[PDB]
Structure 1
Amino acid sequence: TGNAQKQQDINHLLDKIYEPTKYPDLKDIAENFNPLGDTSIYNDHGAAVETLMKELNDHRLLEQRHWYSLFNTRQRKEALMLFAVLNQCKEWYCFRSNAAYFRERMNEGEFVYALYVSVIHSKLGDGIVLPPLYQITPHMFTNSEVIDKAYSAKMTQKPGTFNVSFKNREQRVAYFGEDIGMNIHHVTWHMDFPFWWEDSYGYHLDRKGELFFWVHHQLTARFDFERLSNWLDPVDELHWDRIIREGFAPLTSYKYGGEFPVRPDNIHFEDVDGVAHVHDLEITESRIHEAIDHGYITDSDGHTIDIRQPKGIELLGDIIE
């Protein structure tokens, strides 16, 4: 152990993530290790490990040098299996090993995501401070311009820092939304208290519900404030039966993936194949809005669970998010 060790290892793992590791130790590990030959390092007698492997083997896991969204029900599951290994390691010998072994044949997004969540929640990651996403995978936090300016630097082997950019809109209250600090927090908040947490993982995040209610209420408040300061008017509430008034162009790019799709202004909400129907929301919204109005949330049995009490708002945040 140590930390200036654990730490070191981490830094190495997340170094030039888009390419096979250059740190020799990480690679003989990456090669010689077998997550299945001492089912003892694992507190599960390695059921986790044996499940990743099985996938890695039938090679039914997402490819490397490809994008990844945490909203993709499969990409998530895969990402989250790495979490589950890293998670039941008794000591560092087992983490390093895996987050090396996998690091090299699992996709980067799943991987970056997996490592962070794992470091954050696993028993074994106390000493560590995680590098800032913004510098680990800069395509998600940097402009598309600066990105290309950086690819040029590199082509020519000439160094230096480029100035990023952001009178026509409400990309006047932009400084708020595009800040690398908020973006960090926004992701961290949901890494700290993930929507996918099962108390099987080890403990129980306390009031994730009210936490959820509140955190957004404040982005939402903080946001409303800035627009105040900009002669702008408080934000419109979004409806599924209306047009999406204010659309934008992000001018942002994926590393592997392409450029973030843009949305024109005054658009009509389309039924999106694979996710869900527009109407599917409308009804959800109704079911929600009826719990609130009745006084109770009704479970699967037709058991009405009361929410006209203090535990109220979290039970509500459990069903809303």
Structure 2
Amino acid sequence: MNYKKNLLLLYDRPREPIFMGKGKSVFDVPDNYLTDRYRPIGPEIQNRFGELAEERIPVRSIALPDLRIPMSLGRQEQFSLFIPRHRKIAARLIDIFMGMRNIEELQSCAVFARDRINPYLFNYALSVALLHRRDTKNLDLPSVVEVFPDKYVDSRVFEQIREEATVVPEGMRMPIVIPKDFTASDLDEEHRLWYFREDIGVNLHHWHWHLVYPGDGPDSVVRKDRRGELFYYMHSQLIARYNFERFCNRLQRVKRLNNLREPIAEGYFPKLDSLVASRTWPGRVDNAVIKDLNRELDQIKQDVSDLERWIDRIYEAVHQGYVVDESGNRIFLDEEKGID
């Protein structure tokens, strides 16, 4: 009953229902644990999936926390921790996996949750939980690349893989070469930094940072010592490291955005497609304008001048040498704690 090892299976093939069996194992899930769609074909499922496996994993039925908030984001929708609504949803699902009394009940709770939740969100929240619970330390989480390649690779290679896997028997299959320097041509000097910007290691680093220092969740997960300063310092070392690369590609140091009104010159077309959402990360044209936001579904109604305002407030607070509490009390930006 190595729950720990069995939890790792929940990362295998995130869009495949859990009853299809991961690695060499299958879960034996209660009938009320199946979704409404697949409950009717329960018998057939057992037949193929259930029988072909070496290890069958019994899941004990339990009473389940309220999963509405985490289910409220759609299975074919996109997931961003930058959008407040999604942060709030993730925070809650994290609390739920943190709060299970038992590593066995975590297994049972996750098995239930998995095919009812957005896979990206499931990966995030489950990961943050496994990294923080006492009973799930020392656990070798799969790289996000390994389980969601769609966020890391030219969308063109998926059919190249689909074909190779389908036509060629495995022992004979050729590795697929991942394109590099593929997002832009020589006419865009910015393409020179492909090896920094589009390197799975640095993007994983950015992702890992939001796994260890999430912005909303249980106190235990959020409140790390000096996390406000690490935020500053990490983003600051990235720019230092990014400028080092620029100097090595005959470019200038990177220039801040002048303001939030003038166009952004450098466009970008990522060439990524999401197999979860079956929708792209739309590129941004050259010379695009920042526009007032009214995203009803995302729950974002915010003008550019609302952003201008926060920045102004923040600059006033930096110049004053203190921030003002929600009550009106002064907290000094001293030498020890000001940066945090």
Q: TM-score, normalised by structure 1?
A: 0.84
2: CA distance, partners of 1:137 / 1:70:
16
Pick aligned residue for 1:150 from 137, 154, 161? 161
Cross-structure match for 1:218: 237
2: CA distance, partners of 1:11 / 1:78:
23
2:27 is paired with a residue whose SS is helix
1:14 partnered with 2:5: no
1: CA distance, partners of 2:222 / 2:264:
41
Cross-structure match for 2:110: 99
2:331 is paired with a residue whose SS is strand
1:291 partnered with 2:317: yes
Pick aligned residue for 1:165 from 166, 180, 194? 180
2: CA distance, partners of 1:148 / 1:247:
27
Q: How many residues align?
A: 294
Report how far residue 145 of structure 1 moved.
1.7
1: CA distance, partners of 2:338 / 2:218:
20
Moved more, 83-92 or 158-167: 158-167
1:177 partnered with 2:197: yes
Give, as a single letter, the amino acid of the residue that structure 1 aligns with 2:197: G
Report how far residue 35 of structure 1 moved.
4.1
1:2-81 paired onto structure 2 within 5 Å: 5-21=2-18, 22-23=20-21, 25-28=26-29, 30-31=33-34, 34-36=61-63, 49-52=64-67, 61-81=72-92
1:143 is paired with a residue whose SS is coil
> Do the aligned partners of 2:3 and 2:103 also contact (CA within 8 Å) in 1?
yes
CA distance 1:225–1:212, shift in 2 (3 Å):
same
2:323 is paired with a residue whose SS is strand
> Do the aligned partners of 1:139 and 1:253 also contact (CA within 8 Å) in 2?
yes
Cα-Cα RMSD: 2.2
CA distance 1:138–1:241, shift in 2 (3 Å):
same
Pick aligned residue for 1:273 from 294, 298, 314? 294
Q: Map Cα deviations across residues 10-43 of structure 1 (whole Å, 9 max, x no partner).
A: 331111111102236534254575442xxxxxxx
Report how far residue 67 of structure 1 moved.
2.6
What percent of counterpart residues are identical? 30
> Do the aligned partners of 2:214 and 2:222 also contact (CA within 8 Å) in 1?
no
Moved more, 141-150 or 228-237: 141-150
Report how far residue 94 of structure 1 moved.
1.2
Report how far residue 121 of structure 1 moved.
1.7
Cross-structure match for 1:309: 335
Cross-structure match for 1:264: 285
Pick aligned residue for 1:141 from 130, 152, 165? 152
Cross-structure match for 1:119: 130
1: CA distance, partners of 2:212 / 2:304:
30
CA distance 1:26–1:81, shift in 2 (3 Å):
farther
- Runs of 5+ in structure 2 lacking a partner? 35-58
Give, as a single letter, the amino acid of the residue that structure 2 aligns with 1:180: I
> Do the aligned partners of 1:33 and 1:101 also contact (CA within 8 Å) in 2?
no
2: CA distance, partners of 1:289 / 1:117:
33
Report how far residue 148 of structure 1 moved.
3.3
> Do the aligned partners of 1:82 and 1:114 also contact (CA within 8 Å) in 2?
yes
CA distance 1:278–1:191, shift in 2 (3 Å):
same
Cross-structure match for 1:209: 228
CA distance 1:33–1:84, shift in 2 (3 Å):
farther
Cross-structure match for 2:54: none
> Do the aligned partners of 1:7 and 1:127 also contact (CA within 8 Å) in 2?
no
> Do the aligned partners of 1:76 and 1:110 also contact (CA within 8 Å) in 2?
no
- Runs of 5+ in structure 1 lacking a partner? 37-48, 315-321
Give, as a single letter, the amino acid of the residue that structure 2 aligns with 1:205: K
2:65 is paired with a residue whose SS is helix
> Do the aligned partners of 1:20 and 1:104 also contact (CA within 8 Å) in 2?
yes
